[PDB]
Specification:
The structure is a homotetramer. The first copy, chain A, is of the alpha+beta class. Chain A has 6 helices and 19 strands. A 9-stranded mixed β-sheet of chain A has the order 14-15-16-13-9-12-11-10-17, covered by helices on one side. An 8-stranded mixed β-sheet of chain A has the order 2-3-4-1-5-8-7-6, with helices on one face. The structure holds 4-nitrocatechol, calcium ion, chloride ion (CL) (3 copies) and fe (ii) ion (4 copies). The site of one fe (ii) ion has 6 residues of chain B, from β9 and β13. Chain D: GO terms for molecular function: dioxygenase activity; metal ion binding.
């Protein structure tokens, strides 16, 4: 278990950006800019800095050309410049490796702290960032599939309770989780900004990055991304969805970038900012928990996820989950799920829902 | 081949209603009224008569209590009263069994002809119907999942070219179909009213009714039906979708009523009313033909469909398809499909997507 | 206007309009760059445009000329022989006709243009060059995509006279607006089984009130508004967005660079049954035009496009003598109601929502 | 100028509910429940307690029968029980009248402080509230016009800068405002919860309550409210809209309840939770600032607003605005508005946009 520092936690505002290492910057540009319509804040031959429609900070996504596709940093913005000092002291007390650069690691970010966190993930904390033109009323640019905000990250980690306690001490509040009747936790969602999540934990071998999620305004915007992918004859890069989530109540879609980094498109979850916000726990065998309509979750959603880097840019070693596998217990050969608790009718034994 | 009668074909306007036999009227009522929000035009202890939001004829759906769930009649409205006489002469010349009721078979329909058609389906033709309040601006009644029009029927039949030619002789025009390079036809869609379909043929064992389809105004109305079914903890009755179709380009959902009658919810196909409307043929192995997003088609969608009745109310015997099976050639052990033709990447062999 | 002995042509639908525009590049910016229509052909003289779901060559031809005006409103007929029928029909009416075996505009074949009994330049054609139907080209689809041509709307001084003539041509009236003392202010009529393929608005005419395109959904119309705000051309949004009473469609009216009015429209209802119930609204009903009761801007009633004769000269305008919809509803002696018979929610001598005429 | 207290400001989470006095409880219930679809948490012969689709606290709106329709309280939830004490101390230091009820003023609220604030408005601060069933996935109940959240209040007050500074000291951050080139502020918007607004100030005679705002998921939900009001033949109760706002970038509608309390329906503003969120200032003469599409702002929007009560339940006296009037300077006789700054084309002199004048 991860101890609670004496040192005060930094005041974290929200998830702010991810830096993803990609192998072919032009193929990645085509996906994120031409297919998905993200806005270029800055680009050169090594990196593309992208932002969503409503963002005013420099970027929400940094694509960095490199030899091995992986997450290099998941960044959270903190409330004040002095919260970057707080973050540094906090992670030092945790005995984590840290690195601080007063002029930032990427363009458009100033004084920033990167850490290898207790779960093996590269977190950044920053306040200072270069403001850019907020494009929120640039309806002359607005795409039928427009991505309007960065919403969250999702992390694969082998021991969810261990990770949950650490994130709670950091000030994240759990909104929803998935457990069973035998004391296992399979997933948890937690926030700072008053939505269902800024980050989330999915039980599995880790550290790996499960996905980065962007918001749309409306459900038809997500439908348009699917339709466009069909027209481009790249429907094979649609992994799962579109659907309605149980957990989060959001309308969603999962797609795969050219290096198989998973992107979620997400809309219309609910407000969580009250400190006694009711926590919702789903049973792992409830077939409406992930897709509310009961559509089956493809095995790749559970098994595939991106590598993460340490502060030297090397791939973090993967530690195997020993807790029960959500895949195995719901859709594996001895799996089970139900539509109605206690009802044999609409239940699934050793197979996924819908045939 | 079904010969073309010398007698003139009835001028068919559109699909108008289906009469479905149901086993438990109250359970059916709960599904079609409380879950789906159809509007009651009449009911008693034996039948419920229902219509969509924008309809002015008496009904689009009749639920009739009976011992065996089945399609009892798929009804088309014809342009004039004389077209019912034309229908009678046409089907008589085809050698089909017919029954004429000058005062109708169901309430709110007048002079009507029912036939056991050459594919074994119970068709009704009528002009006369009781007009009711058109609810198209009754936004005080409008549901988040509102069903606004009856759009089409879909019939399972073993020989699609045989059925197609018969429907063409009746004035239906084919808009889209699915074929392979070997020359097999797997499915065809055909219309009178200037949308992609009023009826459609799915290759399979028949006669069986594949589904009845209703439209919504917008895609979010279809999403809401799914969301409602999740809240009612009946998500197991969502069979397939929601999706974008390849064929028709419509946004769609398939759901199952208490007797396993399949209902499609549909929106935003295209105009087909010009007589040289371009006909679109998809290859059966194209994994974007049925769901444009490449989502797999569950086997039950190909194998399960409703019984149909003859004019005595007995179940029509089924004839097995001898042409190749769409299920088998796409998702069965020897099947395949592609995302991009000639590309093994994004292709599926012996396996769905 | 007498019913000919000659049979009417079988009209399928409205198909395209040819608009004369004064600055081709400025018009192109509006129809292509702002509105997203798709180019079938263009040169220094003309731009040929189609909607997202169209397979015929075009829905709109922009023709450079000295005086902005409607040059032709074109209806597609069912067969080649229907063009001959249209020629015989209009000749029996005593109208000036001109037949070109190879068309008046590119991508149309054998075509008949007529100066009709109301002064309007109608075209009838069957033959047209098919193009790529873009209906699944979601790689092109804009947030404001115009998906079909829906209808025309004509300003004419005597609505019943026009209505009777269109009925003889096979159009069926769906909705109209009347008062209690026998004046008709507007009528809507169709061939293709929607509310309208053309429509008559009482006023000085012949003038073209608007051409209408459809979207898939209501949000697509909202986006057009939003885009016009971002482009700082909100002054070219004339009226809306709204819900119509008549037609029940969601709508918007915008103005092109020559003040030609374009309606964007969605989700009217099916009218293809021959006994489709007609709907008559009282002119004083403040929900008849905008169902939400929003006021109808006076320019909507007063302004419309010139139309040309077959020589390309402007048709002389004839004044309406029947009562004016503007005057009887929102003028200083006008009135409208929310609930018939109820003084609460009624407006006298001004428009709804607290405005009077500017 | 309202001084900054030495005492620490309470930590405010969000706007939480309004209590409105209504004259005919059954008529008001018809509007809020039968027309708008809000969910009943409790009712009796005297009050109706209502909540939105996604709410878990007891209510977002209390309708209280009384002789004079008015705003009785605009309630903000605070982060901890101790923040109610901080609120009491803060407002006492400001010299404001306060009333503390350990078991609440209304049902489903616990320990609560009501205050006559320095602008004359009845504010409530509370933490304790009865949780109820959160209906966020009850799609069996979901209306085509569903109101999903309470979003904000908007207050009419004569001196906007004075109010703005007081709210900033209380920890609200201004997201957008409307000013001119002569030093006048006409309106300001300010938040705690990380949306454009939890409350907002509109220049005019006050204190009066301009509106309470609820959100929908999507724009079509707002369209449906309008459609339904047409079907119910109460389109006269649609005051303004629907539209796209300039300020907030939200899609919006204003409607009027049976006592002429104004309700806004709103959707799809943007995130403001970063502390250096860029403040957007619109010029008062920009004809896209209130309605982005340039539609004219109905004069009642500027002139009409609800009475507010003091802690005794008496109506607060109105103080006249002496700063320039937004109505007068934009759509009045000597008014002016533009579409494009510096362009005469698309400008309006002494009248409203789109061909209208003041009635
Ligand atoms: O592409 N298909 O699966 C189709 C297309 C249209 C239909 O109405 C349908 O039921 C199936
Ligand atoms: Ca000035
Ligand atoms: Cl999920
Ligand atoms: Cl109108
Ligand atoms: Cl405003
Ligand atoms: Fe996620
Ligand atoms: Fe179908
Ligand atoms: Fe129109
Ligand atoms: Fe507001």
């Amino acid at each position: 278990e991860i101890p609670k520092p004496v040192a005060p936690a930094p005041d974290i505002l929200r998830c702010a950006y991810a830096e993803l290492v990609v192998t072919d910057l032009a193929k990645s540009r085509n996906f994120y800019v031409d297919v998905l319509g993200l806005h270029v804040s800055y680009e050169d031959e090594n990196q593309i800095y992208l932002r969503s429609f409503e963002e005013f900070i420099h970027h929400n996504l940094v694509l960095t050309k490199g030899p091995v596709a992986a997450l290099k940093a998941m960044a959270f913005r903190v409330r004040t410049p002095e919260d970057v000092d707080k973050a540094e002291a906090y992670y030092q007390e945790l005995g984590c490796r840290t690195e601080r650069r007063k002029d930032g690691f990427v363009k458009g970010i100033g004084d920033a702290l990167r850490v290898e966190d207790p779960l093996g993930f590269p977190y950044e904390f920053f306040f200072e960032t270069t403001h850019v033109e907020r494009l929120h009323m640039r309806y002359d640019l607005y795409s039928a599939g427009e991505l309007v905000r960065l919403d969250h990250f999702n992390q694969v980690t082998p021991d969810v309770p261990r990770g949950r306690k650490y994130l709670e001490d950091l000030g994240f509040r759990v909104t929803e989780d998935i457990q069973d009747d035998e004391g296992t936790t399979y997933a948890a969602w937690m926030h700072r900004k008053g939505t269902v999540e800024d980050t989330a934990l999915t039980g599995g071998n880790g550290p790996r990055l499960h996905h980065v999620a962007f918001s749309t305004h409306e459900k038809h915007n997500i439908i348009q991304i699917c339709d466009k992918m069909g027209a481009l004859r790249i429907s094979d890069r649609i992994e799962r969805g579109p659907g309605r989530h149980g957990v989060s109540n959001a309308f969603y879609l999962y797609i795969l970038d050219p290096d198989n980094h998973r992107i979620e498109i997400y809309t219309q979850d609910y407000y969580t900012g009250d400190p006694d916000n009711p926590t919702i726990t789903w049973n792992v065998h409830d077939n409406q928990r992930r897709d509310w309509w009961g559509n089956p979750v493809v095995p790749s959603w559970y098994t595939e996820a991106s590598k993460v880097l340490d502060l030297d840019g090397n791939v973090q070693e993967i530690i195997e989950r020993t807790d029960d596998s959500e895949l195995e217990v719901t859709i594996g050969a001895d799996g089970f799920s139900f539509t109605r608790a206690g009802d044999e009718d609409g239940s699934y034994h050793g197979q996924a829902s819908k045939g």
